[PDB]
Design a binder for this molecule. Structure first.
Ligand SMILES: C=CC(C)(C)OC[C@H]1O[C@H](O[C@@H]2C3=C([C@H](C)COC(C)=O)C[C@H](O)[C@]3(C)/C=C3/[C@@H](COC)CC[C@H]3[C@@H](C)[C@H]2O)[C@H](O)[C@@H](OC(C)=O)[C@@H]1O
Ligand SMILES: C=CC(C)(C)OC[C@H]1O[C@H](O[C@@H]2C3=C([C@H](C)COC(C)=O)C[C@H](O)[C@]3(C)/C=C3/[C@@H](COC)CC[C@H]3[C@@H](C)[C@H]2O)[C@H](O)[C@@H](OC(C)=O)[C@@H]1O
Ligand SMILES: [Cl-]
Ligand SMILES: [Cl-]
Ligand SMILES: [Mg+2]
Ligand SMILES: [Mg+2]
Ligand SMILES: [Mg+2]
Ligand SMILES: [Mg+2]
Lengths: 236, 6, 236, 6
């Protein structure tokens, strides 16, 4: 419950309908119900899961940044006191965003990561684990900040180690993992040199392996490769 | 303007 | 509750923050709390109220149309049976959208319309009443369809009668009311001739009164006037 | 493509 009474296949079908309707909160609830059925997810199902939560948390993060910016302006010299409401509402959005991250991290810990044995599933879920700890780190300001950052780092690092051993350098999940771990280094871990090195090396190793790919795979790999290029252009 | 993630 | 414990002014301040953050469900909840304080709304507050719900229901209507289209394709000759899930999920979105419309109609009936004595507030709320009955009519298919349509018509008609007597033909609320009543005639009431006549007459009466306006008012009136023109171009 | 309302 509340998805316990719905067939697994019906939850998957409805997640795809919610995706078409851009109803990402519904999509995430349906996929959470699907995961809670206890069976491993297919590649298509894992992508539905990740898209749903990525969109939900993406909207919450964008809102949090708008509110945090307002809050920061309210704390500058010569700004008029407007009371507690900006902080209260930023905290409200923050707590909801934390709850979504804890929900995703809970699904990963119960029991997606432990049953994931193939590299494509294990790396995918460990990348999600890094991403949702990273989103927690974006809003962390207290005594658990370093531990949250560590947790993101640890998840991404295990995903990187598996992906380098078991996946081609052009694999979209390997490329996406590297893209996000590089963003983690640049924006969360105060390590822009490591972010740039990772994005460079990733892009270059992928370029050298493109020759092995069919026309469809080439298009898939080159798309994430352009995101790496976009960040290199921004950061250098 | 915003760095990319995926 | 759940907004009963928050100051009216804090609810208004947070609605404006939610608007900046495009958090329209929060914005609507804050403005519902503000209305429930029992005091009349100012012009700025009424606009916050209407924007919030317009955006919430707008997202639900767009999703409903995506799902209804899928459902309609599933009912055509040669379409493969996929079970109840499309109808179930369209019904789920439909019921939520109905609930939002009933919430807005409830705020209008308790007690915004009865305390609204100036034309600008009375016409605004009666236009909202027409709009939310119209949204109910968009998804109605049963024995209450005609009554829902009647209710939309009646609200818009009272708003039209007040606006023609008490507002200039360029007033944005009068122009917006006419725009939407015209859409009601075209799409809900099967009266495209009346929709076209209303949009024409409205546009022409507004054009003839533009000479009375300051540069700022002229820009305000001409914007809704362009929406009327857009519909005339589409329908003729 | 879609008629306007406000
Ligand atoms: C379109 C929606 C659905 C049906 C959910 O699929 C999303 C997408 O699913 C696949 O793409 C994945 C994928 C994305 C691709 C980069 C999108 O590519 C195109 C051409 O649109 C972004 C998505 O969020 C998704 C699922 C996520 C990830 C990310 C997950 O980390 C946990 C790592 C990188 C990327 C991988 C898994 C991509 O393979 C597919 O290969 C894409 O298909 C094509 C033609 O590119 C499809 O759009
Ligand atoms: C910007 C958001 C807030 C702060 C909530 O205000 C919304 C807007 O509020 C006012 O505009 C109203 C208004 C709208 C204007 C047409 C928007 O104009 C511009 C230039 O953006 C659309 C809004 O939804 C709103 C509030 C709604 C109505 C509609 C309500 O029916 C119940 C009838 C027509 C229209 C009237 C009330 C407009 O006066 C203002 O005159 C607009 O300001 C300017 C410079 O146009 C502002 O964007
Ligand atoms: Cl709050
Ligand atoms: Cl459903
Ligand atoms: Mg079953
Ligand atoms: Mg391999
Ligand atoms: Mg008070
Ligand atoms: Mg008057």
């Amino acid at each position: 419950g509340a998805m316990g009474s719905m067939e697994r296949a019906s939850l998957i079908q409805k997640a795809k309908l919610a995706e078409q309707a851009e109803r990402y909160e519904d999509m995430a609830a349906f996929m959470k119900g699907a995961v809670e059925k206890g069976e491993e997810l297919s590649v298509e199902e894992r992508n539905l899961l990740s898209v749903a939560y990525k969109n939900v948390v993406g909207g919450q993060r964008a809102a949090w940044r708008v509110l945090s910016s307002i809050e920061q302006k309210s704390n500058e010299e010569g700004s008029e006191e407007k009371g507690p409401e900006v902080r209260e509402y930023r905290e409200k959005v923050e707590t909801e965003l934390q709850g979504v991250c804890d929900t995703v991290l809970g699904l990963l810990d119960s029991h997606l990561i432990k049953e994931a044995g193939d590299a494509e599933s294990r790396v995918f879920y460990l990348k999600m684990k890094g991403d949702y700890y990273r989103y927690l780190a974006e809003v962390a300001t207290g005594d658990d900040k370093k531990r949250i950052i560590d947790s993101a780092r640890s998840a991404y690092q295990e995903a990187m180690d598996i992906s380098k051993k078991e996946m081609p350098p052009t694999h979209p999940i390997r490329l996406g993992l590297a893209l996000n771990f590089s963003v983690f280094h640049y924006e969360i871990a105060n390590s822009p040199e490591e972010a740039i090195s990772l994005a460079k090396t990733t892009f270059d190793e992928a370029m050298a392996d493109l020759h092995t790919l069919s026309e469809d795979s080439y298009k898939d790999s080159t798309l994430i490769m352009q995101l790496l290029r976009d960040n290199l252009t921004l950061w250098t | 303007k915003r760095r990319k993630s995926v």
